[PDB]
Design a protein around this nucleic acid. Structure first.
Ligand SMILES: N[C@@H](Cc1c[nH]c2ccccc12)C(=O)O
Ligand SMILES: [K+]
Ligand SMILES: [K+]
Ligand SMILES: [K+]
Ligand SMILES: [K+]
Ligand SMILES: [K+]
Ligand SMILES: [K+]
Ligand SMILES: [K+]
Ligand SMILES: [K+]
Ligand SMILES: [K+]
Ligand SMILES: [K+]
Ligand SMILES: [K+]
Ligand SMILES: [K+]
Ligand SMILES: [K+]
Ligand SMILES: [K+]
Ligand SMILES: [K+]
Ligand SMILES: [K+]
Ligand SMILES: [K+]
Ligand SMILES: [K+]
Ligand SMILES: [K+]
Ligand SMILES: [K+]
Ligand SMILES: [K+]
Ligand SMILES: [K+]
Ligand SMILES: [K+]
Ligand SMILES: [K+]
Ligand SMILES: [K+]
Ligand SMILES: [K+]
Ligand SMILES: [K+]
Ligand SMILES: [K+]
Ligand SMILES: [K+]
Ligand SMILES: [K+]
Ligand SMILES: [K+]
Ligand SMILES: [K+]
Ligand SMILES: [K+]
Ligand SMILES: [Mg+2]
Ligand SMILES: [Mg+2]
Ligand SMILES: [Mg+2]
Ligand SMILES: [Mg+2]
Ligand SMILES: [Mg+2]
Ligand SMILES: [Mg+2]
Ligand SMILES: [Mg+2]
Ligand SMILES: [Mg+2]
Ligand SMILES: [Mg+2]
Ligand SMILES: [Mg+2]
Ligand SMILES: [Mg+2]
Ligand SMILES: [Mg+2]
Ligand SMILES: [Mg+2]
Ligand SMILES: [Mg+2]
Ligand SMILES: [Mg+2]
Ligand SMILES: [Mg+2]
Ligand SMILES: [Mg+2]
Ligand SMILES: [Mg+2]
Ligand SMILES: [Mg+2]
Ligand SMILES: [Mg+2]
Ligand SMILES: [Mg+2]
Ligand SMILES: [Mg+2]
Ligand SMILES: [Mg+2]
Ligand SMILES: [Mg+2]
Ligand SMILES: [Mg+2]
Ligand SMILES: [Mg+2]
Ligand SMILES: [Mg+2]
Ligand SMILES: [Mg+2]
Ligand SMILES: [Mg+2]
Ligand SMILES: [Mg+2]
Ligand SMILES: [Mg+2]
Ligand SMILES: [Mg+2]
Ligand SMILES: [Mg+2]
Ligand SMILES: [Mg+2]
Ligand SMILES: [Mg+2]
Ligand SMILES: [Mg+2]
Ligand SMILES: [Mg+2]
Ligand SMILES: [Mg+2]
Ligand SMILES: [Mg+2]
Ligand SMILES: [Mg+2]
Ligand SMILES: [Mg+2]
Ligand SMILES: [Mg+2]
Ligand SMILES: [Mg+2]
Ligand SMILES: [Mg+2]
Ligand SMILES: [Mg+2]
Ligand SMILES: [Mg+2]
Ligand SMILES: [Mg+2]
Ligand SMILES: [Mg+2]
Ligand SMILES: [Mg+2]
Ligand SMILES: [Mg+2]
Ligand SMILES: [Mg+2]
Ligand SMILES: [Mg+2]
Ligand SMILES: [Mg+2]
Ligand SMILES: [Mg+2]
Ligand SMILES: [Mg+2]
Ligand SMILES: [Mg+2]
Ligand SMILES: [Mg+2]
Ligand SMILES: [Mg+2]
Ligand SMILES: [Mg+2]
Ligand SMILES: [Mg+2]
Ligand SMILES: [Mg+2]
Ligand SMILES: [Mg+2]
Ligand SMILES: [Mg+2]
Ligand SMILES: [Mg+2]
Ligand SMILES: [Mg+2]
Ligand SMILES: [Mg+2]
Ligand SMILES: [Mg+2]
Ligand SMILES: [Mg+2]
Ligand SMILES: [Mg+2]
Ligand SMILES: [Mg+2]
Ligand SMILES: [Mg+2]
Ligand SMILES: [Mg+2]
Ligand SMILES: [Mg+2]
Ligand SMILES: [Mg+2]
Ligand SMILES: [Mg+2]
Ligand SMILES: [Mg+2]
Ligand SMILES: [Mg+2]
Ligand SMILES: [Mg+2]
Lengths: 46, 271, 17
RNA sequence: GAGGACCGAACCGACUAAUGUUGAAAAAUUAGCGGAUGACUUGUGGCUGGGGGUGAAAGGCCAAUCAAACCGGGAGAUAG
RNA sequence: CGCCGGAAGACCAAGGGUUCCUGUCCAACGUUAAUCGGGGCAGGGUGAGUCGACCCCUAAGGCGAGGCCGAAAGGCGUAGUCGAUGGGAAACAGGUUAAUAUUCCUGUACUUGGUGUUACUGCGAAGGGGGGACGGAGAAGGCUAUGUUGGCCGGGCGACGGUUGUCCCGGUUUAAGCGUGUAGGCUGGUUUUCCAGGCAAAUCCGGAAAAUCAAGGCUGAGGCGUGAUGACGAGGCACUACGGUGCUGAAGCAACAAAUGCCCUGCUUCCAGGAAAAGCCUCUAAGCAUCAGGUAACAUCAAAUCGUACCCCAAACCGACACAGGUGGUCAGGUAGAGAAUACCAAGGCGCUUGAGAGAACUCGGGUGAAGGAACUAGGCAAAAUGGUGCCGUAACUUCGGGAGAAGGCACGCUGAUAUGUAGGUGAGGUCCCUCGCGGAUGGAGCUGAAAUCAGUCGAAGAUACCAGCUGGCUGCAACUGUUUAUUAAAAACACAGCACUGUGCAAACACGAAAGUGGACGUAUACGGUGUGACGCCUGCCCGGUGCCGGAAGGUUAAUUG
RNA sequence: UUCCUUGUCGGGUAAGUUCCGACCUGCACGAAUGGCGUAAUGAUGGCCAGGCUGUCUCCACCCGAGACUCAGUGAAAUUG
RNA sequence: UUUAAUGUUUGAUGUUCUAACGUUGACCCGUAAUCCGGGUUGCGGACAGUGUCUGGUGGGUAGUUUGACUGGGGCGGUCUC
């Protein structure tokens, strides 16, 4: 039956995209933590 | 005219509807319409701040004139119309210069009647005058509280205000609730009563009819758990406590008016 | 993983009240 | 030609029985069953955030987790 | 040979991202083998002025210069600026690749801008007005898609009795555009004068008055003509790597039936009273005035960029799987049928990635059963049974609607006649009239076609299969339709229309917010919030001592403060 | 809602702790945390009858898919 | 002890006033703007409202407590001399 993940690229970018993290102070700290860890993919983008 | 429906269904058995055949069967006047989208009872924080509001039929707003400050120019009544935003009916009037406006339709007013606002108008239903020019004892509606602000009191169907006394710069009104209020005599009022006086004689008949007006169901506090409502809880049907609101404030008797800057205008509270 | 359903089921598990 | 009208497919649901129970499936299948122009159902987007939301009210639901979500930290909490 | 065929066929959106096509390989992957594959390796494949995005315009909502507010971080919000799931210019038929096509080729079209020439001319907006622009249900009329039959054309004369005929098989297709303006729908038209309105102006909109005309205008499916001396075309002939390729090519009409599609954003009706903004049309202001600009014709130039393969009810998406699950839209053939149910079929697509034997108990899914018929069991659980249309007939009770399909019963196939096919529907020719055409009257050929009666006839059975109510009597609870414990509870629980109490005079009570503010409500006591009860009928008795709430002010007690 | 209790009486059955009607001794009903009725409605609770039947007396046979044998692939819980 | 008078006032109540303060009244401007600010005016007016201090109320919310013995716990009884 219907599971929990129903993909949609528009709602994926508007919620966890780059421009959405960079909008608030707390979202720019998520990016600072992921650069400090050294992740190959900062956000879930294209 | 109230008409009882026939019990061809269990949802039609108790319906009583108020049907007025003089209403305009057609579209409203377009230049006086606005968009009016619904809230759900939610404020700019997103939260429900008033409960039991939601859904309903789509409605458009009719820009009604509550000020009536087009003095000196006579106006003829064109038609009576339906307004989904209020309990009373509205009348479309046409001034001599070619301007059209909506007003609250008073009792007994038909299509073709002549109305006129201003300080020198005649004492007949539909005319708006400052309350220093209205005889003591008259029945008015659409009363102002501040001069030039617009009518605020006695707006809904069948309601009216009585002018009890005039002493100085103030007039004493008998509000529809039974309250005696002082209002300054420069404020305007309209002669007569508000029409559609049998709006209160209707019976919705079924639970879906209340949902067409954007009224969602009320759950009784005694039917919840203690975490939800002060009345919640019980093994069976218990109550055992003084009735209160969902936020613990005593209902059924406890007064809630605390406004010290308007107490001087109130002669006698309602009883 | 989730446990075996018969270990969850109140009738089977709580047999000696 | 009205109706929260009637019988009944799509569509929405979930009353009974049998099977399955290291399943074909972490809730289904088969045979029956209820609503089916409405308080209906559905696509796309949006808003409400944790002692908070939302709730036709079952402590129900809030990503297979809910009488207080999840992640990280205080943290090697404390454990007669 | 079997299965699906309102899909298990075809086309997409979302999502995925090379799974597409060709060659080659079989270690691993595939629940077995594999020469095969959505597997490995290499190469190829996605072509647009018109399709979609981008673009212009906005909804819910987001962000938000100044601003208001807040220990800081920040919150709200004006001017603005974004934001589709909505509004806004334009293309069709045929052919072609292993793989793309409304994109390539052939034929025939259309749209919006820039520039230039000629002719004429009051152009101009961040402003005014119009338009865009809108609900549910219902009914009917006119049509088409489509189908069937006849005619026409090509072929056939049948493995076993018959088959030159009232016989058998196949085909009978053609678009956008351009021209005409029909069934239907709406509306009176024109001219002159004036005006407290449309933030100023206006010749535009609104209002007033007068004169005059019996018509005008707008909208509109389909048909017809052209597009088309073309294209396609059953077949036939000629080659071949036997896959395919090349050439030629007949008829290509009529009647009837007919949509859930179109006219129709229509019409009628009801109450619950049904987006916004731009493109578009028009008016003028500041302004410019032999300028610029506007209108029409002609010529010329431009229309960029990104997507385009393939799967999409699924082995490619969400479910850890090549997983009996989930997933929005579009298309909708035949016979029977009311039907998108159901049975059998067409186009098309498949036989579900372990098989071969045997014919024990026992389990699962089914078929039938002597005599009995609930004796079974907690309980008729489960099974069995009823089941259609038409007609006759139908009780208590009732809120007069119901109960009710109550219960119960009868007819039902086929053939012939009434009637070489009836009632009904459609309607050619011919004739007449004018308004001379997509017109009206008459007329009836042809086509289509129930239902009934009478007579006969076959079987055990004629609603023959699939499909398709079990019925009745007494009683508890809840009035009723609804809602609920996703995943052991659907209920007597929740809700409900109705009733009552109570708060609230508007900067309302109340709720969310350190606040600003927002909802209540662009509402105003016939309104709004909270509480309890729960349709309707007859009703709702006594107690204010306790706790709570409402009112009172004399007296007693009583905080900071003063000292 | 009634402990005593399967109260007592009547109906229905050959036989009825359930059901229906009545009595009143209401352990411990009662008027809007409503009382008593009530047509229609309910995948609601209890009881009775007709029809129908493998539910049963009491099982028998048959048609398929497994179980069994052969070839290929090849698990799991548990375990001093 | 007890009062009246004058001068002055303190505290109380009342009455007017406007100039602080309020305005979710009207109009004008910034301005293409239902925010905001400024100006004019009207209506309230030393009230309301806010800060500090203070009495009351306050399961709306929070942190916690709710003994042991015991022929099992609870109930009952007991706990020192
Ligand atoms: N036994 C059932 C239902 C079930 C699922 N999860 C459960 C948990 C508890 C009891 C039963 C269940 C099953 O295995 O499908
Ligand atoms: K407009
Ligand atoms: K309720
Ligand atoms: K309870
Ligand atoms: K109807
Ligand atoms: K219908
Ligand atoms: K919707
Ligand atoms: K929490
Ligand atoms: K999670
Ligand atoms: K291999
Ligand atoms: K497999
Ligand atoms: K769109
Ligand atoms: K314009
Ligand atoms: K005009
Ligand atoms: K393509
Ligand atoms: K065997
Ligand atoms: K039936
Ligand atoms: K239910
Ligand atoms: K419930
Ligand atoms: K009230
Ligand atoms: K509002
Ligand atoms: K008392
Ligand atoms: K009392
Ligand atoms: K009392
Ligand atoms: K009792
Ligand atoms: K007896
Ligand atoms: K007896
Ligand atoms: K009742
Ligand atoms: K039920
Ligand atoms: K019943
Ligand atoms: K002032
Ligand atoms: K004060
Ligand atoms: K002991
Ligand atoms: K013992
Ligand atoms: Mg409410
Ligand atoms: Mg209510
Ligand atoms: Mg509960
Ligand atoms: Mg509580
Ligand atoms: Mg109780
Ligand atoms: Mg219905
Ligand atoms: Mg559900
Ligand atoms: Mg089920
Ligand atoms: Mg089913
Ligand atoms: Mg049904
Ligand atoms: Mg139905
Ligand atoms: Mg159904
Ligand atoms: Mg509805
Ligand atoms: Mg969950
Ligand atoms: Mg906690
Ligand atoms: Mg530890
Ligand atoms: Mg520590
Ligand atoms: Mg690959
Ligand atoms: Mg392939
Ligand atoms: Mg293999
Ligand atoms: Mg493949
Ligand atoms: Mg491959
Ligand atoms: Mg590969
Ligand atoms: Mg903002
Ligand atoms: Mg700081
Ligand atoms: Mg925009
Ligand atoms: Mg292809
Ligand atoms: Mg406009
Ligand atoms: Mg056609
Ligand atoms: Mg020939
Ligand atoms: Mg021949
Ligand atoms: Mg022969
Ligand atoms: Mg033929
Ligand atoms: Mg705009
Ligand atoms: Mg997938
Ligand atoms: Mg999958
Ligand atoms: Mg995984
Ligand atoms: Mg498979
Ligand atoms: Mg699958
Ligand atoms: Mg579906
Ligand atoms: Mg079918
Ligand atoms: Mg086929
Ligand atoms: Mg043998
Ligand atoms: Mg067998
Ligand atoms: Mg038998
Ligand atoms: Mg027999
Ligand atoms: Mg028995
Ligand atoms: Mg027995
Ligand atoms: Mg049964
Ligand atoms: Mg009877
Ligand atoms: Mg009757
Ligand atoms: Mg009847
Ligand atoms: Mg009958
Ligand atoms: Mg009983
Ligand atoms: Mg009910
Ligand atoms: Mg559960
Ligand atoms: Mg459940
Ligand atoms: Mg259930
Ligand atoms: Mg209320
Ligand atoms: Mg109740
Ligand atoms: Mg009482
Ligand atoms: Mg008191
Ligand atoms: Mg007895
Ligand atoms: Mg029994
Ligand atoms: Mg009894
Ligand atoms: Mg009681
Ligand atoms: Mg009681
Ligand atoms: Mg009571
Ligand atoms: Mg009763
Ligand atoms: Mg129901
Ligand atoms: Mg083996
Ligand atoms: Mg192992
Ligand atoms: Mg172990
Ligand atoms: Mg004062
Ligand atoms: Mg506590
Ligand atoms: Mg602690
Ligand atoms: Mg102890
Ligand atoms: Mg003890």
């Amino acid at each position: 039956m219907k599971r929990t993940f129903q993909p949609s690229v528009l709602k994926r970018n508007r919620s966890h995209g780059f421009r959405a993290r960079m909008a608030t102070k707390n979202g720019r700290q998520v990016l600072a933590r992921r650069r400090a860890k050294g992740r190959a993919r900062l956000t879930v983008s294209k | 005219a109230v008409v009882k429906c026939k019990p061809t269904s269990p949802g039609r058995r108790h319906v009583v509807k108020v049907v007025n055949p003089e209403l305009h069967k057609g579209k409203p006047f377009a230049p006086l319409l606005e968009k009016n989208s619904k809230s759900g009872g939610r404020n700019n924080n997103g939260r429900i701040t008033t409960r039991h509001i939601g859904g309903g039929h789509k409605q458009a707003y009719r820009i009604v004139d509550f000020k009536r400050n087009k003095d000196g120019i006579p106006a003829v009544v064109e038609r009576l119309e339906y307004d989904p935003n209020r309990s009373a009916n509205i009348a479309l009037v046409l001034y001599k210069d070619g301007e059209r406006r909506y007003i609250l339709a008073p009792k007994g007013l038909k299509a073709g009647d002549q109305i006129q606002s201003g300080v020198d108008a005649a004492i007949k239903p539909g005319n708006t005058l400052p309350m220093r020019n209205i005889p003591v004892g008259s029945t008015v509606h659409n009363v102002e509280m501040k001069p030039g602000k617009g009518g605020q009191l006695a707006r809904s169907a069948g309601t009216y205000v009585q002018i009890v006394a005039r002493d100085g710069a103030y007039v004493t009104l008998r509000l529809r609730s039974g309250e005696m209020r002082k209002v300054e005599a420069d404020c305007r009022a309209t002669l007569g009563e508000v029409g559609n006086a049998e709006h209160m004689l209707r019976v919705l008949g079924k639970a879906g009819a209340a949902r067409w007006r954007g009224v969602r169901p009320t759950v009784r506090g005694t039917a919840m758990n203690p975490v939800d409502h002060p009345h919640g809880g019980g093994e069976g049907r218990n109550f055992g406590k003084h009735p209160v609101t969902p936020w613990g404030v005593q209902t059924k008797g406890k007064k809630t008016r605390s406004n010290k800057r308007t107490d001087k205008f109130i002669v006698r509270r309602r009883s | 993983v989730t446990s075996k359903w018969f270990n969850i089921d109140n009738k089977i598990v709580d047999h000696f009240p």
